[PDB]
Design a protein around this nucleic acid. Structure first.
Lengths: 38, 556, 141, 176
RNA sequence: AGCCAGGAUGUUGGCUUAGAAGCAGCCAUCAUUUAAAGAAAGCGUAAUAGCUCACUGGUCGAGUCGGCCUGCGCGGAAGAU
């Protein structure tokens, strides 16, 4: 999980759910599109 | 003795991919780790092997009880394999005459002279499980030199009369020349095999296909490694036909007044070409002669030597060999090689065009300050039909520079036209026009305008992005499956100018036009695309370019 | 006719026997012997002077079967068969070269009227005027 | 809501034991009980079960929205069951069932044989296909996902242990 | 929002045709049928077969959706007996 202050909804099918409070964004086929902070 | 090693799968995979008809004989007992028995099905006997010894036992027993039915359903397909081999066993498969161990092989041995069935055997080499089993089939399923059609010497050119000669000692002598290795003791060696006839020690053995006379020296046999001098060579031994003056691939080793062969079929083509370069200049004296004893060994090792740059451009069919012949040079031939790139026509062209570059000349060489502020205009690389690579359009403003000082400016430009601001890449075939030639009297000489013109030409290239006039090869690639779509996409990374995708019965042949400058590691790259499954041709057709843009910063 | 299994209309000029690589996949969809589609159409291909892309459609069936529908060549290539050049659309509304009147357009529409139930005469007339303006062609009667 | 427009119909063959907050479902082959939270108002009304969010816990629309989906699965899981098949694609990798134990031919220097808990009747038609049968929807995944986590789907070959319906995304080497 | 569900079909959409064949990119950017379809968004990809968005054409049978303004909250937030 890459970390950066900006979670920008980037991939076309990008889920966003708030697990534990810190946002981590869920793609389907792209592992590269998953950030976690912010 | 490995996981995933199903014996019945692989032999019944040949009937799907290779399309052949294998009927196996020696089956399997054991779950690959407690494996102890190999099921010979003719005699219906399992063989015990060594506990872990390198070779003690051969204990034959019956079929074990854990495989009493798989031996039943597979033996009935063994005894099928003679009713459809010979027509005479057809009526005793159904009538029920006993199909013994000795009777069935008399039909199946004649099924090896046509080769419709192959005989398969499972076992371990390293665990000493099967090796002592595998030898008895060789004398009963692999053919002998006296059971085969023997030496068949045709004629020469008169008439096609193929003549089966005798496999015994009662014929004129005959052999063939292959596996012709080398040594630092006698020079050339052979690994030749005599098919029939006996030779004594010392003979005028010729090579009757290429009209040369040779004499038969001291013949030596091996344990594949150790020198054992074989004096009297009997019919069927394999030895070293030593002392051949010249010898090629597969010519005869035969006394005159005898039958004669003339046969060389499927001369290969070593495809991948890398250019070896010496380390010292004392090395090229001994690397120019490296082609002597090395290329004499084998036709899978060629040297496509150039006509101008005089470097030694080798050719192999695999880089895996072009590994080894450098390592063959290393410790015994004692050569330090610097393996580099082949001679591709690298004629620097020009992308951009400089407006005006003035050669700055100011020096009191001959008494007074010999000046020479001459300026040239970078003209486009002269295209079409231009035999002369130097096209100096000397445009003296009003014929101001005298005829005596015309060679001066000419020499300077010509010197840098043959040179190159990258790695000495000739900027040849590039038309160059003189803008204005400053002329003087006591300040006018040869260096005056020569030195100036030299710098001026180089200055221009720095702001003219000289690219690379390059040769383009007609590259074909033969790949069977639908795995060429990854290839031609990866070929599109390399300016393979596509022609068309065509098919054969088993292969999908792709036609393209690839820059010879973009060859580099082409062989090793397709061998990781095609997995080595490719067999194709290499020709030439057009001539194009390859991106450089080095004048920007790379070129000083 | 059929549904989500397969329906693509792709065939180009039938002088070429071997399926052209981009057409290949529409024959590489439901397991054909490619010799069958070469032997189906050539009984009627000898009633033409080849050079124009003639279209067929593919449509499939359960086991190993297939079917196909023969029509006439479209009027889009018939616009640029008479006009000499096969590709004229470089600038649509800035090129004024080449005239054919409506009488040519309806006689290449009777061969549509004798073949197909859509692509009717009077409705296609503006689109056979519409493929003229995109190519940069003129029309007067 | 959609969940409020979703009542569940218990059929004959599965008995409920409504001791208020603790429901123990007496079913066909097991006992699928869940001790829910106090954000629910449960009533097996006539035959079709009706539920309700308790006051104070107005977020119990979520907490019983779990429950409406929950007990529907429980009454159909104790009777019919789940086929949870896994696909073993591994070079020399086998699967064989004995009692309640599964072997794991997993490319190691030692065998891995892990015993599997109650609510599991496992089977193996071959070395690469493995049945799991169960009554709870949780337990039919939890014992399955542990095996898959021992050898995840490798996206350079397609190697690994993977589900029946799961489709991996294998890549290409592209350098050497 | 999901399961059935056609992805109605003129066309090869040019150019330059080697494939730039809706899926590389610049100019057009009409539509034969309009209760469902654009000369078009990505993936499959040299091109396409596979899978969708397009209208949800038929079922559920009620609410639902994208942004503007503020009350506060979370992440951003790592230091040295």
């Amino acid at each position: 999980m890459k970390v950066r202050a900006s979670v920008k909804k980037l991939c076309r099918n990008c889920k966003i759910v708030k697990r534990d409070g810190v946002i981590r964004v869920i793609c389907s086929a792209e592992p590269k599109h998953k950030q976690r902070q912010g | 003795d490995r996981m995933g090693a199903n014996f019945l799968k692989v032999v019944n995979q040949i009937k799907t991919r290779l399309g052949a008809n294998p009927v196996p004989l020696q089956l399997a007992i054991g779950a690959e780790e407690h494996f102890t028995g190999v099921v010979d099905l003719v005699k219906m006997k399992a063989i015990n092997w060594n506990d872990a010894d390198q070779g003690v036992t051969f204990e034959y027993e019956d079929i074990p009880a854990d495989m009493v039915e798989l031996a039943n359903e597979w033996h009935q397909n063994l005894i099928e394999s003679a009713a459809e081999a010979s027509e005479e066993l057809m009526e005793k498969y159904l009538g029920g005459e006993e199909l013994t161990e000795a009777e069935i092989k008399g039909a199946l041995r004649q099924r090896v002279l046509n080769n419709e069935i192959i005989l398969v055997t499972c076992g371990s080499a390293f665990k000493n499980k099967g090796v002592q089993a595998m030898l008895d089939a060789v004398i009963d399923y692999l053919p002998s030199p006296v059971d085969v059609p023997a030496i068949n010497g045709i004629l020469d050119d008169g008439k096609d009369t193929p003549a089966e000669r005798h496999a015994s000692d009662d014929e004129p002598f005959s052999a063939l020349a292959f596996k012709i290795a080398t040594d630092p003791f006698v020079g050339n060696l052979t690994f030749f095999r005599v098919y029939s006839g006996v030779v004594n020690s010392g003979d005028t053995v010729l090579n009757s296909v290429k009209a040369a006379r040779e004499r038969f020296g001291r013949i030596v046999q091996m344990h594949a490694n150790k020198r054992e001098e074989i004096k009297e060579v009997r019919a069927g031994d394999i030895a070293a036909a030593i002392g051949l003056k010249d010898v090629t691939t597969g010519d005869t080793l035969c006394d005159p007044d005898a039958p004669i062969i003339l046969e060389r079929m499927e001369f290969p083509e070593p495809v991948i070409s890398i250019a070896v370069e010496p380390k010292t200049k004392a090395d090229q004296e001994k690397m120019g002669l490296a082609l002597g004893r090395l290329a004499k060994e084998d036709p899978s090792f060629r040297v496509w030597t150039d006509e101008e740059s005089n470097q030694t451009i080798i050719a192999g069919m695999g880089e895996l060999h072009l590994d080894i012949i450098v390592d063959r040079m290393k410790r015994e031939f004692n050569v330090e090689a610097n393996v580099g790139k082949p001679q591709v026509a690298y004629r620097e062209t020009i992308r951009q065009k400089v407006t005006d570059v003035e050669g700055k000349h100011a020096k009191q060489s001959g008494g007074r300050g010999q000046y020479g502020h001459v300026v040239i205009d970078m003209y486009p690389l002269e295209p079409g039909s231009n035999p002369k690579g130097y096209e100096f359009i000397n445009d003296i403003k009003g014929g101001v520079i005298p005829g005596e000082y015309i060679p001066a400016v000419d020499k300077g430009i010509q010197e840098q036209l043959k040179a190159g601001p990258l790695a000495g890449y000739p900027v040849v075939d590039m038309g160059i026009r003189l803008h204005f030639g400053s002329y003087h009297d006591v300040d006018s000489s040869e260096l005056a305008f020569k030195l100036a013109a030299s710098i001026a030409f180089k200055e221009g290239f720095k702001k003219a992005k000289p690219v690379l006039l390059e040769p383009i090869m007609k590259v074909e690639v033969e790949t069977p499956e639908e795995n060429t779509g990854d290839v031609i996409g990866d070929l599109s990374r390399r300016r393979g100018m596509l022609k068309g995708q065509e098919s054969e019965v088993t292969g999908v042949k792709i036609h393209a036009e690839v820059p010879l400058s973009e060859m580099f590691g082409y062989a090793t790259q397709l061998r990781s695309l095609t997995k080595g499954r490719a067999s194709y041709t290499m020709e030439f057709l057009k001539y194009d370019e390859a991106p450089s843009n080095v004048a920007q910063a790379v070129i000083e | 006719a059929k549904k989500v299994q397969a329906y693509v209309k792709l065939q180009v000029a039938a002088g070429m026997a071997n399926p052209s690589p981009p057409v290949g996949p529409a024959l590489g969809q439901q397991g054909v012997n490619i010799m069958e589609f070469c032997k189906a159409f050539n009984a009627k291909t000898d009633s033409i002077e080849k050079g124009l892309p003639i279209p067929v459609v593919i449509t499939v069936y359960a086991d190993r079967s297939f079917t196909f529908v023969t029509k006439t060549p479209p009027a889009a290539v018939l616009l640029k068969k008479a006009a000499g050049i096969k590709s004229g659309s470089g600038k649509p509304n800035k090129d004024k070269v080449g005239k054919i009147s409506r009488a040519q357009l309806q006689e290449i529409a009777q061969t549509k009227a004798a073949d197909m139930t859509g692509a009717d005469i009077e409705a296609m007339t503006r689109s056979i005027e519409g493929t003229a303006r995109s190519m940069g062609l003129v029309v007067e009667d | 809501s959609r969940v409020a427009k979703a009542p569940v119909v218990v059929p004959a063959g599965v008995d409920v034991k409504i001791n208020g907050q603790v429901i123990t479902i007496k079913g066909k082959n097991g006992e699928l009980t869940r001790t829910l939270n106090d954000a629910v108002e449960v009533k097996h009304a006539d035959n079709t079960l009706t539920f309700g969010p308790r006051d104070g816990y107005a977020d119990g629309w979520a907490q019983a929205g779990t429950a409406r989906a929950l007990l529907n699965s429980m009454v159909i899981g104790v009777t019919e069951g789940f086929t949870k098949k896994l696909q073993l694609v591994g070079v020399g990798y086998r699967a064989a069932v004995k009692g309640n134990v599964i072997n794991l031919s997993l490319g190691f220097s030692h065998p891995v044989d892990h015993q599997l808990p109650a609510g599991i009747t496992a089977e193996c038609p071959t070395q690469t296909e493995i049945v799991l049968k169960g009554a709870d929807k949780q337990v039919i995944g939890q014992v399955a996902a542990d095996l898959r986590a021992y050898r995840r789907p490798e996206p350079y070959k397609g190697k690994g242990v993977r589900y029946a319906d799961e489709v991996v995304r294998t890549k290409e080497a592209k350098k050497k």
